[PDB]
Amino acid sequence: QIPASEQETLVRPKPLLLKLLKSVGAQKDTYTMKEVLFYLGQYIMTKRLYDEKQQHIVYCSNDLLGDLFGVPSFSVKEHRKIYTMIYRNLVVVNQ
Ligand SMILES: CN1C(=O)C(Cc2ccc(Cl)cc2)=C(c2c[nH]c3cc(Cl)ccc23)[C@@]1(O)Cc1ccc(Cl)cc1
């Protein structure tokens, strides 16, 4: 899974990921990973990216999320893969 310490990592989304988060009502510039995942959840649900037949799949090929993450789809069960994709779109804030 993902260690608790790592969920609490402080991060500053780069401009395009920040715009995506703000488009679903995020207000800040600095987040924990846990908060980033919250707003991605909202984004995904709002843009209706979940596959109808296989609900664990986010089909993001035709969406900005697919451009940022660099994949046509991902499974919500693949946490480490997701954290890897997110990290490419942010800067980690020391301590
Ligand atoms: C379908 N969902 C989940 O499986 C988890 C848990 C999850 C997902 C990805 C990773 Cl890397 C880790 C954990 C969710 C949520 C994640 N955080 C939340 C907070 C609230 Cl308050 C509600 C749902 C969720 C969510 O509800 C929504 C979701 C959030 C982020 C991503 Cl990338 C995909 C889906």
From Swiss-Prot:
Disulfide bonds: none annotated. Residues 1-84 are annotated as: Sufficient to promote the mitochondrial pathway of apoptosis. Phosphorylated at multiple sites near the RING domain by ATM upon DNA damage; this promotes its ubiquitination and degradation, preventing p53/TP53 degradation. Residues 1-93 are annotated as: Necessary for interaction with USP2. It is found in: Nucleus, Nucleoplasm; Cytoplasm; Nucleus, Nucleolus; Nucleus. Induction: By DNA damage. Residues 9-92 form the SWIB/MDM2 domain. Ubiquitous. Isoform Mdm2-A, isoform Mdm2-B, isoform Mdm2-C, isoform Mdm2-D, isoform Mdm2-E, isoform Mdm2-F and isoform Mdm2-G are observed in a range of cancers but absent in normal tissues. Interacts with p53/TP53, TP73/p73, RBL5 and RP11. Binds specifically to RNA. Can interact with RB1, E1A-associated protein EP300 and the E2F1 transcription factor. Forms a ternary complex with p53/TP53 and WWOX. Interacts with CDKN2AIP, RFWD3, USP7, PYHIN1, and RBBP6. Interacts with ARRB1 and ARRB2. Interacts with PSMA3. Found in a trimeric complex with MDM2, MDM4 and USP2. Interacts with USP2 (via N-terminus and C-terminus). Interacts with MDM4. Part of a complex with MDM2, DAXX, RASSF1 and USP7. Part of a complex with DAXX, MDM2 and USP7. Interacts directly with DAXX and USP7. (Microbial infection) Interacts with herpes virus 8 protein v-IRF4. It is linked to Seems to be amplified in certain tumors (including soft tissue sarcomas, osteosarcomas and gliomas). A higher frequency of splice variants lacking p53 binding domain sequences was found in late-stage and high-grade ovarian and bladder carcinomas. Four of the splice variants show loss of p53 binding. Lessel-Kubisch syndrome: An autosomal recessive progeroid syndrome characterized by short stature, pinched facial features, prematurely gray hair, scleroderma-like skin changes, small kidneys and consecutive kidney failure, followed by severe arterial hypertension. MDM2 RING finger mutations that failed to ubiquitinate p53 in vitro did not target p53 for degradation when expressed in cells. E3 ubiquitin-protein ligase that mediates ubiquitination of p53/TP53, leading to its degradation by the proteasome. Inhibits p53/TP53- and p73/TP73-mediated cell cycle arrest and apoptosis by binding its transcriptional activation domain. Also acts as a ubiquitin ligase E3 toward itself and ARRB1. Permits the nuclear export of p53/TP53. Promotes proteasome-dependent ubiquitin-independent degradation of retinoblastoma RB1 protein. Inhibits DAXX-mediated apoptosis by inducing its ubiquitination and degradation. Component of the TRIM28/KAP1-MDM2-p53/TP53 complex involved in stabilizing p53/TP53. Region I is sufficient for binding p53 and inhibiting its G1 arrest and apoptosis functions. It also binds p73 and E2F1. Region II contains most of a central acidic region required for interaction with ribosomal protein L5 and a putative C4-type zinc finger. The RING finger domain which coordinates two molecules of zinc interacts specifically with RNA whether or not zinc is present and mediates the heterooligomerization with MDM4. It is also essential for its ubiquitin ligase E3 activity toward p53 and itself. Belongs to the MDM2/MDM4 family. This is E3 ubiquitin-protein ligase Mdm2. It comes from Homo sapiens (Human). The lineage of its organism: Eukaryota, Metazoa, Chordata, Craniata, Vertebrata. The chain holds residues 18 to 112 of 491 of the full protein.
